[PDB]
C-alpha cells in the first residue's frame, strides 16, 4: 500500500511434527477451507516418501525446500517505454513462498491417481534434481543471469 | 389504482363473505368419510357450481390508501410508497430505522 506496514500473521505448528513450515505448506495445499483434507493429503505424501528412504520427514522436506528455493529474480521496470527486466535479490519469505507454490503446482500437474502420491513423487523428483519446480528455478536463474548486466 | 379496480376488489370481498359458510359446509361434506359417496359427489358438484367470486383465491391485496397491487406488506396494510412516508413522519408506533 501507500502507507502503513502490515504485520505478518502467525501459523500454528502442525500437530504431528510441530513444524510451522509444514503448517504453511498445508495452508498452500488447502482449498475451500478443507484443512482436514489438506493435512490428510500432506501426511499421506510424507508417509509415502518416508517409505522409500528411512530419514526424518521434516529434514527431508526442508532439504528439498532448500534445493528448490530461488536465488535471483527480475522485477519489470517501465522506463522509456520498455520492459527493462532488472535482476534483484528476494527476501527469504518470498523465497519460501515461491518454492512451496512451485512444488504444489508441479504436483498438481503430475499424473498420478491421488494428490498425496503425486506430491510425494514431486518431492522425490526435487530431491533427485529433476522436476518442474527445479525447471522453474533453473529458468529464473537463466533469465536473471541473461539480464545480470543492469544493476 | 382506479376506482373501478377498487370497486371490483370490494365486490369480490363481499361475495366471499356471503358464500363462505356454504363453501365451508360443502368442503366439510366432501372431506367427511362417513358421508355417502353420492352425497360427496353432490357436495363436489355444488361447490363447483358456486359463483366464481366466492372463491378467496381471486382476491388481491391492495394498499388501502392508494390501492397499489405491489409491495403490500401484510402487517401494516400499506404499500411501500405510503408505508415509508407514514413511518418517517413518525405516525407508525414502534417502527424505527435498523442498524445492526
Amino acid at each position: 500500500p501507500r502507507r502503513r506496514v502490515v504485520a505478518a500473521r502467525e501459523i500454528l505448528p502442525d500437530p504431528k511434527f510441530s513444524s510451522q513450515t509444514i503448517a504453511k505448506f498445508m495452508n498452500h495445499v488447502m482449498q475451500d477451507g478443507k484443512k482436514s483434507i489438506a493435512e490428510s493429503i500432506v501426511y499421506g505424501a510424507l508417509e509415502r516418501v518416508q517409505e522409500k528412504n528411512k530419514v526424518d520427514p521434516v529434514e527431508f522436506f526442508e532439504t528439498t525446500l532448500e534445493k528448490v528455493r530461488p536465488m535471483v529474480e527480475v522485477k519489470a521496470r517501465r522506463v522509456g517505454g520498455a520492459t527493462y527486466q532488472v535482476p534483484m535479490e528476494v527476501r527469504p519469505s518470498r523465497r519460501t513462498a515461491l518454492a512451496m507454490r512451485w512444488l504444489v503446482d508441479a504436483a498438481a500437474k503430475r499424473s498420478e491417481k491421488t494428490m498425496a502420491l503425486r506430491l510425494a513423487g514431486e518431492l522425490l523428483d526435487a530431491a533427485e534434481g529433476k522436476g518442474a519446480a527445479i525447471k522453474k528455478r533453473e529458468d529464473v536463474h537463466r533469465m536473471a543471469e541473461a539480464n545480470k548486466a543492469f544493476s | 389504482a382506479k376506482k373501478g379496480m377498487i370497486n371490483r376488489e370490494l365486490k369480490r370481498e363481499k361475495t366471499v363473505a356471503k358464500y363462505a359458510a356454504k363453501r365451508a359446509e360443502l368442503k366439510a361434506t366432501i372431506a367427511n368419510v362417513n358421508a355417502s359417496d353420492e352425497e360427496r359427489f353432490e357436495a363436489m358438484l355444488k361447490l363447483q357450481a358456486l359463483p366464481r367470486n366466492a372463491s378467496p383465491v381471486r382476491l388481491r391485496n391492495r394498499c388501502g390508501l392508494t390501492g397499489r397491487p405491489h409491495g403490500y406488506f401484510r402487517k401494516f396494510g400499506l404499500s411501500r410508497n405510503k408505508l415509508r412516508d407514514t413511518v418517517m413522519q413518525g405516525d407508525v408506533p414502534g417502527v424505527v430505522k435498523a442498524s445492526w
Partner: protein, 82 residues
C-alpha cells in the same frame, strides 16, 4: 394432473349439452368455451367447437382423444416461421 380421488372435471353446461346431444341424434356441433374440460368416454362421435381465443375450431371426438382436455386440440398461437 388432477388427483384421481377427485375424479375428472367437466363443466356443467358442457356436460348437459353433451347429454342432450347423445340422448337425441343430431350432428350439429356443440359450441363451447370450456377448454379446461376433459373428454369423457361418452364424448366419442360428437363434433365440439372449442374457442381458441378468437374463433371456434371444430373437433370430432374419437376414442384416441379420451383423457385429453378440449383445449389440447385448439392451438392458440399462430407461428409459421422466422
Amino acid at each position: 394432473p388432477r388427483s384421481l380421488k377427485k375424479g375428472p372435471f367437466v363443466d356443467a353446461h358442457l356436460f348437459a349439452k353433451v347429454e342432450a346431444a347423445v340422448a337425441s341424434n343430431s350432428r350439429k356441433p356443440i359450441k363451447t368455451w370450456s377448454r379446461r374440460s376433459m373428454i369423457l368416454p361418452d364424448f366419442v362421435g360428437l363434433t365440439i367447437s372449442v374457442h381458441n381465443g378468437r374463433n371456434h375450431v371444430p373437433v370430432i371426438v374419437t376414442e384416441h382423444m379420451v383423457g385429453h382436455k378440449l383445449g389440447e386440440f385448439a392451438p392458440t398461437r399462430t407461428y409459421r416461421g422466422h
